[PDB]
Amino acid sequence: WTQAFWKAVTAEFLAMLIFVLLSVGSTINWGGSNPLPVDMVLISLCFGLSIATMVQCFGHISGGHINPAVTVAMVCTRKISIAKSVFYITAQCLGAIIGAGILYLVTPPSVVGGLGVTTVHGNLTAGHGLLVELIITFQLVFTIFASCDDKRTDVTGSVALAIGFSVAIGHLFAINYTGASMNPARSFGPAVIMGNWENHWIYWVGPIIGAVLAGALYEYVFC
Amino acid sequence: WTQAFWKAVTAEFLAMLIFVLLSVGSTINWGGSNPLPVDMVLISLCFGLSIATMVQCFGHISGGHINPAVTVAMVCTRKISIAKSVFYITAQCLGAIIGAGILYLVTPPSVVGGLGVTTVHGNLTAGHGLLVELIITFQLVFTIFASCDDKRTDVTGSVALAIGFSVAIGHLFAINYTGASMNPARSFGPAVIMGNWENHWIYWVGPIIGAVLAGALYEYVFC
Amino acid sequence: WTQAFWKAVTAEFLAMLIFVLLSVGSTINWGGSNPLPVDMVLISLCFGLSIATMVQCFGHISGGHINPAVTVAMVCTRKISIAKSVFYITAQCLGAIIGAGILYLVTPPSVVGGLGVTTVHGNLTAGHGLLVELIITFQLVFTIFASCDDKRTDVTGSVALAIGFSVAIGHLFAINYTGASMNPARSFGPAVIMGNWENHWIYWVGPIIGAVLAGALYEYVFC
Amino acid sequence: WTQAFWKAVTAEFLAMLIFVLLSVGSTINWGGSNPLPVDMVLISLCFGLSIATMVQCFGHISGGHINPAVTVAMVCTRKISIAKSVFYITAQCLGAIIGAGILYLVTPPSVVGGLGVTTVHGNLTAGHGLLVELIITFQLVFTIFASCDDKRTDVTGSVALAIGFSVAIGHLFAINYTGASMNPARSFGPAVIMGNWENHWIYWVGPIIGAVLAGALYEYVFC
Structure with missing residues (x-):
């Protein structure tokens, strides 16, 4: 293709x-x-700061998509070629x-x-788990687009951290x-390795729908 | 009115x-x-970073008031029309x-x-709970006005984070x-849904008094 | 004197x-x-972010000394008049x-x-407690002077946060x-209210010695 | 040599x-x-914010290498003389x-x-412990080089914090x-004092290999 x-x-x-x-290694x-103790603040800060770190290392050389739903929302919003976007998901x-x-x-x-492996429960259905995902991946993709949007008051502070902290609170x-x-892809990785695929479809369409609707809302509504 | x-x-x-x-979903x-364990650092970081995130997504398109006491202090300090401010509280x-x-x-x-739902106890009265609120919503609105005040040494770092961290330590x-x-409004939401209104008045006047007195102190005293 | x-x-x-x-209210x-559980991350983040917040609200209008050892190191380094510095300690x-x-x-x-009230134990002496204080108030005043030093690569990120995070790790x-x-003064406050003054002298000279030696090292040695 | x-x-x-x-004092x-409770978020934030603080105090006067693997990667990438680099490791x-x-x-x-003292277990071998180190010191040195690389979009937010947060998630x-x-050197210090040297070699070559490969990847591959 192109070395770049x-x-x-x-x-x-x-x-x-x-x-x-x-960050998965933190779980x-x-x-x-x-037993545990099940420290959220640990798992939570790990996963956010990890992303905040990765965008800091690579943002300037890939985009720091690092997340297929972001990649789908990038393309759906016309930002990345349809063919460019297929060489990302797989690499992801x-x-x-x-x-x-x-x-x-x-x-x-x-490791037991x-x-x-992201697995939907709390007794919730599939649509709840769809929604909880749909909603957050939204909040998260909306952070990415808002913070990464030229022609603004050059948003205060680390753009990596914002996008980190979004993962976090998420x-x-x-x-x-x-x-x-x-x-x-974050849930595609381990699913492959352990063979546990419970409600796996839910982690593609959930996050993708939320990704688009938050790609959409920024581009064609709020701006 | 106006699309804007x-x-x-x-x-x-x-x-x-x-x-x-x-963030309420973190409680x-x-x-x-x-039982719990009742992690404050969890609830605390959630609620601050959530706000820090929301101002990051929307600040540039609404103000990120996201809090009626801020809205009242905004108007009391003449910043938002009396009619503009009524379409915020309700939307909030x-x-x-x-x-x-x-x-x-x-x-x-x-969820039990x-x-x-913010509920005043520790054995405290209503005036204590008034004060503890009055005081913090102060510390918090004073952060908002100080950090969001043109003609300053373009305050170092994320303005969203400051306003986040204020919620946090709060x-x-x-x-x-x-x-x-x-x-x-943060306590108006759940109060409606669950019907629990114990000392609810305390969460309007407390935070509003503190909001004004900290809107006041910045505008007519400290500056 | 002067309204300013x-x-x-x-x-x-x-x-x-x-x-x-x-922040004392967090202890x-x-x-x-x-019992407790004795969450450090709670007490620790509280006290740092509180300072990071206070310098953010007031830095532009006082200095955000908010700490007599800093005030002593400010004067010892010739930055604040001898008479200006006495109206700070008392106000502090x-x-x-x-x-x-x-x-x-x-x-x-x-509250029991x-x-x-800062109280020196772990079985340590007074000189240990002197040192542990001397040392940290150093690390902390050195952060203040380094970060607040015109003619530098306009240090990246929130100056308030640096000075916060220093309190924190401290x-x-x-x-x-x-x-x-x-x-x-942070330990002068509660000492007055509760009457507990165990090793109180240790919290003036410790932090002050460390304050000077770190005021000194920046000014006359490292720069 | 030279006063500078x-x-x-x-x-x-x-x-x-x-x-x-x-930060070792936090362990x-x-x-x-x-017993413990073994708070990671404590140890973790301590060690990252400590570094974030130290680079903030000294970055402008040494480099804030503060880590021999960084020093080795600095020299291997031609940034520091071979003789300059020997007066750092020892001082470190x-x-x-x-x-x-x-x-x-x-x-x-x-203190028991x-x-x-960093000691490789979990039942892991020496090569695992090599790798876990190799890998992270990588992620960490890659953060340092990416964030500290002139001719970029003057990376958002505190460079000290990035390099801090990298230590952290690490x-x-x-x-x-x-x-x-x-x-x-972080593991050379205590090893000397307590005499415990279990797998100590693992903390020089691990981190150094990772240091180079991440010095390398930035310089001769990614840029």
Whole structure:
């Protein structure tokens, strides 16, 4: 294709690779099958700051999409070619798969948790889990577009942190609801490795619908 | 009215809608009627970063008032028309009501907590609870006005975060005292949904008095 | 004196008033005489973000000294008149006293803790407690001078946050050692109200020595 | 040599001195030989914000290498003379040794923990512990180079915080795996003081390999 382009695909692969390794590696529970204590502030800050870090390392060389729903919302909003966008999802889907892969064999025998495979419960349906995802991936993609929107009062402070903190507060609520994915490839990675696919469809359409509707709302409504 | 104006009312509705859903949804206790553990750092960071996020998404399109006491202090300080300010409170009061609404049916049967309805105890009176609120909503509105005040040394770092962190440290103290509302509509939302109105008046006048006195102090005293 | 000057004294009084109320009010243990759980991350973030907030509200109108050791290091480094500096300590010493004052009667009957009066133990001597303070108030005053030093690469990000985070990591270690004061007036306030003065001298000379040596090192050595 | 140069060596000595004292002093467990509770968010935020603080105090006068692997990656990437780089490691290796030193005698008799000597377990091998380190010190050095790279969109927000948050999320995962060193001198300090050298080689080559490969990837591949 283009060296520029294929660097960015690389950057996209490595970035998911570290995101899901570092932050999924936080879901790890050192007291596997008791107990926890189940620290959200840990899991939550990990996953947000990890993204805030990754966009800081790679933003300038890929975009820091690092999330297929963002990629879908990018294309649906006309920002990335239809063909450019297919070389991202896969690089994001292999990056996660070998991010969790690498993780699997470096974490000991306490992984039992399922490496943290987003799994919808609390007794909720599929539509609830759809919604909880739809809604947050929204709040999150809306953060990305608002903060990354030229011709504004050069938004105060770290753009990476905003997009981080969005992931955060997003985990800071949804974790027991849905897994708090808001990211198809983030849940595609471990699903492959452990074979657990319970309600997996829910983590593609949920986050994608929310991604578009928040791509949409910025572009054609609010601006 | 004006499309500009009515976008901002929309932005105001959606923003409370996500604020109270995401952050009130954090007050949720996964061990309802035991136990907790009652993580403040969770509830606290959630509520601050949520606001820091919302002002980041919408600040540039509404103001990120997202709080009637701020709206009252805005008008009392002559910043927003008397008629503009009535289309905010209601949009903030419906936004909260359907923010909690949406929440009610996505959270399972562990909500028992009361979706987190600010309720004044610790054995305190009503005047204490008035004060604890009055005081913090002050500290908070004073942050908003200080940080959002043109003709200054273009204050270092994220203005959203400052206003976030103010909410934070504000929760980081008052939570067991008062609920740590510092926000009438934030406590108007759930009150409607659950019917629990214990000392509700206390969350309008407290935060409003504090809002004005901190709107006042900036405008006519300190500057 | 001068309205400008006496505004700043006011700003200095109010700022300690909120700092020690909000953050000392975090040391409060809702399970007084069991139990805790003794959350440092709570106490720690409270005290740092509180300062980060206060400098954000008042920095532009007083300096955000909000700490006599800083005031002593300011004067010792020739930055503030000898007479200007005496109207700060007292405004900082009344501000704390009525900050804790106001707190005393708004917190219920769980205050037993001593409103959080910095008290040197762990079995340590007085010189250890001197040092642990001396050292941190150093690390902290060195942050203040480094970050607040014109003619630099206009330091990245919130100057308030840096100075906040310094307080933080400072509490994030010293809390069980010394109380983690690094601030004479912060421990002058509650000491007055509760009458507990155990090793109180240690919180003036410790933090002041550290304040100077870090005022000194910046001014006459490192620069 | 040069006063400029030897100031920076000083700055390098003092900075590790405070980093390892403050943040290693956080690993301290007030319930030594039970129990903990083992707060990661504490240890994690301490170690990141400590670095974020140190680069803020000294960055402008040394570089804020404060980590031999960074120093090796700096030289391997041609940024620092071979002779300049030897006066850093030692200043970083004495700074840590007397940082922990000073700590040893200020912490009481609850230090038992080993002052927090990075020690590779979870049942992992040496190559796993190599990798977990190799990988993170990578993620971390890549943050340093990306954020500190002139000719970019003057990266949003605190550069110190980015480099802080990288340390953070880095601890936020690896702590039970490896100790989460990502820093040879940080683990050289306490090793000297307590005599515990279990897998110590692993904390030089791991972090150094990762340091280079992430120095390399930025310089000769991604840019």
